[PDB]
Design an enzyme around this catalytic site. Structure first.
Site, PDB file in Angstrom:
ATOM      1  N   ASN A  11     -12.307  64.433  37.508  1.00 42.68           N
ATOM      2  CA  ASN A  11     -12.663  65.280  38.678  1.00 42.68           C
ATOM      3  C   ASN A  11     -13.689  64.455  39.455  1.00 42.68           C
ATOM      4  OD1 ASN A  11     -14.445  68.454  39.204  1.00 42.68           O
ATOM      5  ND2 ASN A  11     -12.804  67.543  40.467  1.00 42.68           N
ATOM      6  N   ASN A  64     -16.919  71.100  48.948  1.00 43.92           N
ATOM      7  CA  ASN A  64     -15.516  70.744  48.712  1.00 43.92           C
ATOM      8  C   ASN A  64     -14.959  69.848  49.826  1.00 43.92           C
ATOM      9  OD1 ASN A  64     -14.725  72.375  50.881  1.00 43.92           O
ATOM     10  ND2 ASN A  64     -14.181  74.112  49.552  1.00 43.92           N
ATOM     11  N   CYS A  73     -20.309  74.088  39.551  1.00 46.37           N
ATOM     12  CA  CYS A  73     -19.456  72.976  39.112  1.00 46.37           C
ATOM     13  C   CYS A  73     -20.180  72.113  38.103  1.00 46.37           C
ATOM     14  CB  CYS A  73     -18.962  72.102  40.271  1.00 46.37           C
ATOM     15  SG  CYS A  73     -17.815  70.825  39.667  1.00 46.37           S
ATOM     16  N   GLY A  74     -19.891  72.343  36.814  1.00 45.48           N
ATOM     17  CA  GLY A  74     -20.506  71.557  35.710  1.00 45.48           C
ATOM     18  C   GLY A  74     -19.959  70.133  35.459  1.00 45.48           C
ATOM     19  N   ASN A  75     -18.821  69.752  36.075  1.00 46.71           N
ATOM     20  CA  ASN A  75     -18.467  68.308  36.157  1.00 46.71           C
ATOM     21  C   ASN A  75     -19.503  67.698  37.067  1.00 46.71           C
ATOM     22  OD1 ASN A  75     -16.112  67.816  34.546  1.00 46.71           O
ATOM     23  ND2 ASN A  75     -14.872  68.872  36.151  1.00 46.71           N
ATOM     24  N   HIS A 159     -11.503  83.683  32.369  1.00 51.04           N
ATOM     25  CA  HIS A 159     -10.629  82.915  31.450  1.00 51.04           C
ATOM     26  C   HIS A 159      -9.837  83.775  30.531  1.00 51.04           C
ATOM     27  CE1 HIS A 159     -12.625  79.138  32.587  1.00 51.04           C
ATOM     28  NE2 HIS A 159     -13.662  79.994  32.814  1.00 51.04           N
ATOM     29  N   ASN A 190      -8.269  81.639  34.953  1.00 51.27           N
ATOM     30  CA  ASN A 190      -7.921  80.380  34.316  1.00 51.27           C
ATOM     31  C   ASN A 190      -7.287  80.636  32.955  1.00 51.27           C
ATOM     32  OD1 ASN A 190      -9.436  78.363  36.254  1.00 51.27           O
ATOM     33  ND2 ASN A 190     -10.953  79.993  35.846  1.00 51.27           N
ATOM     34  N   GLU A 208      -5.451  76.281  35.861  1.00 52.17           N
ATOM     35  CA  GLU A 208      -6.591  76.783  36.631  1.00 52.17           C
ATOM     36  C   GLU A 208      -6.243  77.743  37.745  1.00 52.17           C
ATOM     37  OE1 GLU A 208     -10.061  74.351  38.037  1.00 52.17           O
ATOM     38  OE2 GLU A 208      -9.270  73.027  36.479  1.00 52.17           O
ATOM     39  N   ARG A 209      -7.144  78.692  37.920  1.00 52.67           N
ATOM     40  CA  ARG A 209      -7.049  79.652  38.974  1.00 52.67           C
ATOM     41  C   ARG A 209      -6.872  78.885  40.284  1.00 52.67           C
ATOM     42  NH1 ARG A 209     -11.686  84.067  40.156  1.00 52.67           N
ATOM     43  NH2 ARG A 209     -13.002  82.170  40.082  1.00 52.67           N
ATOM     44  N   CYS A 217     -10.864  71.022  32.728  1.00 55.03           N
ATOM     45  CA  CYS A 217     -11.579  72.186  33.249  1.00 55.03           C
ATOM     46  C   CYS A 217     -12.688  72.454  32.218  1.00 55.03           C
ATOM     47  CB  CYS A 217     -10.631  73.375  33.281  1.00 55.03           C
ATOM     48  SG  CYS A 217     -11.412  74.919  33.798  1.00 55.03           S
ATOM     49  N   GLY A 218     -13.939  72.043  32.482  1.00 54.73           N
ATOM     50  CA  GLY A 218     -15.052  72.192  31.492  1.00 54.73           C
ATOM     51  C   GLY A 218     -15.315  73.663  31.184  1.00 54.73           C
ATOM     52  N   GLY A 220     -13.111  76.052  31.251  1.00 56.85           N
ATOM     53  CA  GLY A 220     -12.045  76.457  30.316  1.00 56.85           C
ATOM     54  C   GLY A 220     -12.291  76.003  28.877  1.00 56.85           C
TER      55      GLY A 220
END
Lengths: 274, 275
Positions: A11, A64, A73-75, A159, A190, A208-209, A217-218, A220
């Site tokens: 990502n 975005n 957003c944890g990535n 989730h 998700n 993913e949603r 997806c972290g 997830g």
């Protein structure tokens, strides 16, 4: 404008130091920069700012590719933490940051991974949101003719987690879309397909949603582990193998935050004309 | 390794100076670097080298995102000429260069565009390759229920050029893949949809061999004007408007080389650690 290009399990981010540089964006500029041929090429832009608070090290914002701001957003969090250390903006192991989702402490580990406090998983159906009678460890869902057993949990986003024998044969392409917009998920979900390899090791695919299958997806990964822990299937520290690579989740159960440890790769540094 | 990201209105390049630094690649490294998420992200890699003949200013080579070398006339030429100037490798405006396709002189104009000699268009069906009885100015082709009239030409690569009333209403999305892999093109073809605005001006959309529609295909622009010139529709100097922007093509006809003039845009400079 100096920038770094980074990714957390595929990502990808343009990351900018707006602490030591004057940096100006508009939504149109962000759109142009996001374009993979005409610009830098990224899924999201992360801008690092001063804290304006003596109990914080930084603020960061994420935009975005359409140029609008993004909430969690944890990535992002992992790329942020490694970026400020790589660029010499801080030397701290434990970095205090404010974001659009509130304040956080991020820890950069000895092996150059970043540990993120993802908060306490919330299993309450109304918090997901999920239509149910009450919170249950396992729900029965119908996906057309198929009977599905799942766990459902909110990590700040919704989730639905299904145990499968083998992620490689899981009906992700067919079941994913049906469950992602199921009537029981008012804001969609998700959909995780979780193969338990050992109590300490799962393989995972996530539909993913609004996006379909993604590489990593972290949130997830956190959700699958929280559900698998609650269902009695998993230990308190779990290796999660997603298509894009590995995350490590740690959670001591209700009354505790869940932690997500993951990599953030620094790809190259650039300077954009402008 | 220092590099620059550039494009010529269509496909993008990672461009690297192999004159002032040592540049080491492997087919697999190129593939990793080309990856848009995991790497730099580019369609082609352009490597700028010192000349191996005292008669030349530079050599350049180009690799695709699969890591294999590309030998297509004029490919990456505009980015190359602008790059050597902006990197301060040269101050010349007439730049002599060797490539996989032979030697060229490139000219950087007063408005910083680059003029490329693209060689002489080759209309022989065997050279395309194209299945036909013999060279004709117009061919009738079968596309579904529809009869297509087209011209066919090689610019080093295969083109099929169809005249349309309006590029915006042109059936690019449906006619394009049908012609692109038509059985009469043994090696497939770039499919041009050409709207003649006047003798000196066309609009063009190109459905490229093994890639679909792009924002600008330089060789497609060449081919369209060559075919339009042959068909008596076009003047010797033609402005070509593609979705990505403008090229200008000049060709005096059979016996002459065709020249393409167009921009190269410098997007950013970068540095990547390669272990």
């Amino acid at each position: 404008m100096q920038f770094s290009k980074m990714h957390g399990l595929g990502n990808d981010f343009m990351v900018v130091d707006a602490v030591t540089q004057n940096v100006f964006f508009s939504p149109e500029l962000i759109r142009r920069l996001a374009d993979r041929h005409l610009g830098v090429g990224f899924d999201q832009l992360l801008v690092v700012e001063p804290p304006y608070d003596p109990e914080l090290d930084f603020h960061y914002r994420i935009f975005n590719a359409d140029g609008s701001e993004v909430a969690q957003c944890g990535n992002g969090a992992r790329c942020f933490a490694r970026f400020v250390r790589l660029k010499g903006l801080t030397n701290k192991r434990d970095i205090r940051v404010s974001t659009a989702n509130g304040r956080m402490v991020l820890t950069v580990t000895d092996d150059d991974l970043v540990r993120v406090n993802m908060g306490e998983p919330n299993f309450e159906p109304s918090a997901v949101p999920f239509r149910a009678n009450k919170a249950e460890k396992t729900y029965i869902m119908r996906a057309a003719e198929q009977t599905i057993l799942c766990g459902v949990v909110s990590m700040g986003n919704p989730h639905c987690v299904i145990q499968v024998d083998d992620v490689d044969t899981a009906a992700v392409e067919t079941l994913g879309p049906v469950l992602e917009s199921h009537e029981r998920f008012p804001e969609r979900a998700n959909i995780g397909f979780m193969q338990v390899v050992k109590r300490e090791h799962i393989r995972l695919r996530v539909y993913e949603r609004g996006a379909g299958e993604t590489q990593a997806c972290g949130s997830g990964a956190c959700a699958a582990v929280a559900v698998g822990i609650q269902q009695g299937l998993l230990a308190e520290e779990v290796r999660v193998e997603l298509p894009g690579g590995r995350l490590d989740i740690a959670w001591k159960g209700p009354g505790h935050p869940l932690y997500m440890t993951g990599p953030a790769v620094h790809v190259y540094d650039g300077f954009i004309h402008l």
